Write a protein that binds this DNA or RNA. Structure first.
Lengths: 120, 114, 209, 56, 122
RNA sequence: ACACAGGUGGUCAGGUAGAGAAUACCAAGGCGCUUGAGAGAACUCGGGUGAAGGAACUAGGCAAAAUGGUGCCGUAACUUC
RNA sequence: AAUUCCUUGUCGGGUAAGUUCCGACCUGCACGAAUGGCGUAAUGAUGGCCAGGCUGUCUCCACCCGAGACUCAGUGAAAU
RNA sequence: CGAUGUCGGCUCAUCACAUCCUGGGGCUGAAGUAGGUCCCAAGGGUAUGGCUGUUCGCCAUUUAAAGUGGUACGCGAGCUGGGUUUAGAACGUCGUGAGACAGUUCGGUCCCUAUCUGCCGUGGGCGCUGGAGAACUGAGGGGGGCUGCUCCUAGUACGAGAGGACCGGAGUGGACGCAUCACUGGUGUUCGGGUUGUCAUGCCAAUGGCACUGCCCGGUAGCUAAAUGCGGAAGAGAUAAGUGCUGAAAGCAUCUAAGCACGAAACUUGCCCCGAGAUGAGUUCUCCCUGACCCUUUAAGGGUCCUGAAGGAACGUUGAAGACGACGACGUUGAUAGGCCGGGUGUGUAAGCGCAGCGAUGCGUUGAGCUAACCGGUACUAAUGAACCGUGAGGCUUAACCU
């Protein structure tokens, strides 16, 4: 049912999800690999790939982005020079999802989410 | 084969003058009145516009003394005849439903200067 | 009576000079291929086996492919055997399409109903709710009109419950033919058709007098 | 209103005859190692698709 | 909408500013009145010189409502400020000597079809 | 009796909004309530928005919603003044 | 009448109709003078009634967002 | 007496017939329209408000019926607390008094996670006899079945005369069941725009975090009724009461004895849906596989090898399906999910620039900018080869015909 809703509801309030995904997507650029859960990681591509594609267009009016949606205070000094010129040209697919099964003795679907470091 | 958005265009008109919300339209329509075919006229400004397929409609409000009549029309109707588009109106919204709440000089639209 | 299998697309308006806009449900025809022709050999009966349109058939099984080989060279949709009535229906001459509607103006349409999940009673079955007023709590929409007293002991279908409803055969007989064009392969009717866009819509002329 | 007779040790088995959430069903083969892994999952030792990833 | 306890103005003369709607009637489960549907009404302030008196219950028809009338083609013709015409239950036709507002011709049932034969331009 | 929303007297006080020791946002300072991951069901408990009629609802305007600030005007009967 | 048997009295007004509201009747089966009688204003965790304002209480429900319910996993009660 | 909680209401129907509306037949003091009124039948159908706790009684207004009744005189592991109902208290009256009134008035508490039968929906095991894929028959079941008012059929039928009707329709309303999103409004916390407070961003332009989504207004996708659409059929079969023919027993008379017909709004077939666990398990088409050895306290078991079809499922990408399973797509022979690059509905011309302007701000570039479901292209990123289950022509008896 859920009428027309196509995005999954996961865990916590929509407000907590907003900030958790904001914090995870910005930090994955520096961590390169994050360990988390499969349902959560399958929705991370929806916010971390457009953050890398944000450096595909070049303009003095494009540097004020990542300030109203998916804020991070440190990528805004390096990302436009590092991944904008050649990597962001591919406009998506920068992520690898690693299905790892159980974490320990509990029930949580464990996953690792990483960024591709070389395209060829 | 292929009939959606296509079959309804066989009943759509070959030309109609272009107009936007807030414009003063002056529409003429054919009526039989239980006796005899006559051309009737309706004056006013458009408060909501047509944009979609054959049966998309627009609402016209008399507004010339801030009060009086309001009526709905369709530009592809076979009884709607002609439209004068007598003035273009200056407005900053898509819908003008607040002109059904105003009745004084606060109901006035200015010229668009298109 | 043979069904023409029209599929669901949408509704349009068509107008007349009196300004009446005349809303009508749209169906666009592709008609049958005819893929067996049964006559006398099995239980004395006659039946056509219609097959509708064409399909990509990109993963079909050998039990399906060995039948498509005797049906023709292009693979169609569905089957529908369609048994014929004696002196009323024929398989002879050219295969038939929208000439079924040249003078008969009522029709019937079979399709597949939409899935209601819980379904319940106060929407589907026209039952009244209990009010949240006068300090009343805990049972407003919960069903419970199921007995007396000890007297009932057994339940009949006038009593209604929750549980899955939908996704089964549904048929409507409310439809009236407004315009047919055999060169445009078009059928226009007054009234709405069940379920989702696409689907099947079996569609045949009425047999009620 | 309440239990007035204890359910049988046959009824216990009638409610435990479908209790296995995992059987567990057969594995999948790698592509550069003589190793095997769970269907669409990387092993706890890093083996998957001939990639040997995030190993310990 | 025009339902129970609705307080509205009369379209005939001598009825005064206020009359009250007191059930729709004519069948099972009857609620709300559309243009030309007969409703039961009570008189409250009527002019002393008029043919009708206070607290005597009559039949009336809706002549103004924002649901309007669409029977002719499907396009809705609407009216501002809810109003009714007073109907004779025995001799038929309206009961006033004048009528207010611009009115409509879709009131075509023979027991009130005389409404097009009056001083209005309809 | 419980890592129990209960009980418990004294002592100090801030940006901005505010008449205020009410209340919104926040600083200093403190803390993330000692099970986890998902699904998106009726139903129960809590919230949001609502057309045109209007108390017709119901024993009964219960309940809920509207109003709500300040300045300048304007102020009835009844009255022991 | 918080007092009333016929009695949900009788009659005027208020309703569409009123076992209720206001007033008048006296025939109070049983009001009545500190055992208190009559009487008025501000006020009142006050019973009854009329009109308006404002309203999902209703006409008639319709859509929207959470928690518990649902699924698996953790550590694991009660009447009977 | 180890408790079947008190009256009415709301919710909810269901059975009866001494039939209320519908049908069938009839007498009338029924010439006609109405009216009075009795047999026969349980398919379909039978009102809301005021004071009042009251259903009720009274009243107001409505019916085709608002019929007469049964259901623990149908209502609490279903509700409200008004009647009923104590412990506060009063008015009237009685009883020295402590108490007392099914008198009166204010006030006065409403607990409940299901074991099994009853039920609704939904998995897994077993049966239908080689395995697999699927479409057809139809034992039997349910649904459909009612109607007010007016106008036409008809000033025709009847009757001094006034007045004024059947068949079968249409116009306008309803009950009830059933289906849609095209209309139209509402909603629409994944779309857009405006705005108050305050903190953050050095500050400002500008943009977030929180404040009922802070507040205000539009609105896609979709839901929805406050919107729109629709209905009780012909042929064939067979049926109380009633309509009966020819005719005896009982010369006549008779529907019955011998012998054979008509027929109701009811009903079987016919239509619409279910349905072969219909263990009485039916039919037919499309697809596939043409194998061995050792041991024994064996007419039966336990081991090993060759070779596994057609197909199915898991495992995935998820949805028109959904509480969970089940089930509809698509898994590179790919459009299934996500994304990109656009279009469209929706919003409303931005953040910038240029000019004008004390400045708030306006106008031009600009129908700007932004987007989610609607629509198009695309393999950009992800759905691996396999592995797994599914075996080698398929038990027993009889008849005839050709040999």
């Amino acid at each position: 049912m859920r009428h027309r809703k196509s995005g999954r509801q996961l865990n916590r309030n929509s407000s907590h999800r907003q900030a958790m995904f904001r914090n995870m997507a910005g930090s994955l650029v520096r961590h390169e690999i994050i360990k988390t859960t499969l349902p959560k990681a399958k929705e991370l591509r929806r916010v971390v790939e457009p953050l890398i594609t944000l450096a595909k267009t070049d303009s003095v009016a494009n540097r004020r982005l990542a300030f109203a949606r998916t804020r991070d205070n440190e990528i805004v000094a390096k990302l436009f020079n590092e991944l904008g010129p050649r990597f962001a040209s591919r406009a998506g697919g920068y992520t690898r999802i690693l299905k790892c099964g159980f974490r320990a003795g509990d029930n949580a679907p464990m996953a690792y989410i990483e960024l591709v470091d070389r395209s060829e | 084969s292929n009939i959606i958005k296509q079959l309804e265009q066989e009943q759509m008109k070959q030309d109609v003058p272009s107009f936007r919300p807030g414009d003063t339209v002056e529409v003429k329509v054919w009526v039989v009145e239980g006796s005899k075919k006559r051309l009737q006229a309706f004056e006013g400004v458009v408060i909501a516009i047509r944009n979609r397929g054959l049966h998309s409609a627009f609402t016209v409000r008399k507004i010339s003394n801030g009060e009086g009549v309001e009526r709905v029309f369709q530009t592809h109707s076979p009884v709607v005849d002609s439209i004068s588009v007598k003035r273009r109106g200056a407005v900053r919204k898509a819908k003008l439903y607040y002109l059904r709440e105003r009745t004084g000089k606060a109901a006035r639209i200015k010229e668009r200067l298109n | 009576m043979i069904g023409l299998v029209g599929k669901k697309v949408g509704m349009t308006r068509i107008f007349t000079e009196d300004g009446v806009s005349i809303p009508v449900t749209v169906i666009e025809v592709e008609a049958n291929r005819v893929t067996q022709v049964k006559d006398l050999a099995n239980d004395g009966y006659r039946a056509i086996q219609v097959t509708t349109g064409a399909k990509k058939a990109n993963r079909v099984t050998k039990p399906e492919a060995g039948h498509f080989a005797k049906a023709g060279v292009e693979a169609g949709r569905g089957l529908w055997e369609f048994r014929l009535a004696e002196g009323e229906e024929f398989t002879v001459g050219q295969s038939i399409s929208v000439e079924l509607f040249a003078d008969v103006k009522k029709v019937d349409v079979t399709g597949t109903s939409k899935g209601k999940g819980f379904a319940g009673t106060v929407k589907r079955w026209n039952f009244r709710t209990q009010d949240a007023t006068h300090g009343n709590s805990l049972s407003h929409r919960v069903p419970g009109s199921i007995g007396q007293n000890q007297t009932p002991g057994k339940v009949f279908k006038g009593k209604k419950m929750a549980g899955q409803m939908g996704n089964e055969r549904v048929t409507v007989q409310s439809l009236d033919v407004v315009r047919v064009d055999a060169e445009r392969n078009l059928l226009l009717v007054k009234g709405a058709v069940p379920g989702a866009t696409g689907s099947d819509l079996i569609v045949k002329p009425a047999v009620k007098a | 209103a309440v239990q007035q007779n204890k359910p049988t040790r046959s009824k216990r088995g009638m409610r435990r005859s479908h209790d296995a959430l995992t059987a567990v069903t057969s594995l999948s083969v790698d592509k550069t190692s003589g190793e095997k892994h769970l269907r669409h999952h990387i092993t706890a030792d890093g083996y998957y698709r001939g990639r040997k990833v995030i190993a310990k | 909408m025009i339902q129970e306890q609705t307080m509205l103005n009369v379209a005939d003369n001598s009825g005064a500013r206020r009359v009250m709607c007191i059930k729709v009637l004519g069948g099972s489960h009857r609620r709300y009145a559309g243009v030309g549907d007969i409703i039961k009404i009570t008189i409250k302030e009527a002019i002393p010189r008029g043919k009708v008196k206070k607290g005597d219950v009559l039949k009336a028809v809706v002549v103004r409502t924002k649901k309007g009338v669409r029977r002719p083609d499907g396009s809705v013709i609407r009216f501002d400020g809810n109003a009714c015409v007073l109907l004779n239950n025995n001799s038929e036709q309206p009961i006033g000597t004048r009528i207010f507002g611009p009115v409509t011709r879709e009131l075509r049932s023979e027991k009130f079809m005389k409404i097009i034969s009056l001083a209005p331009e309809v």
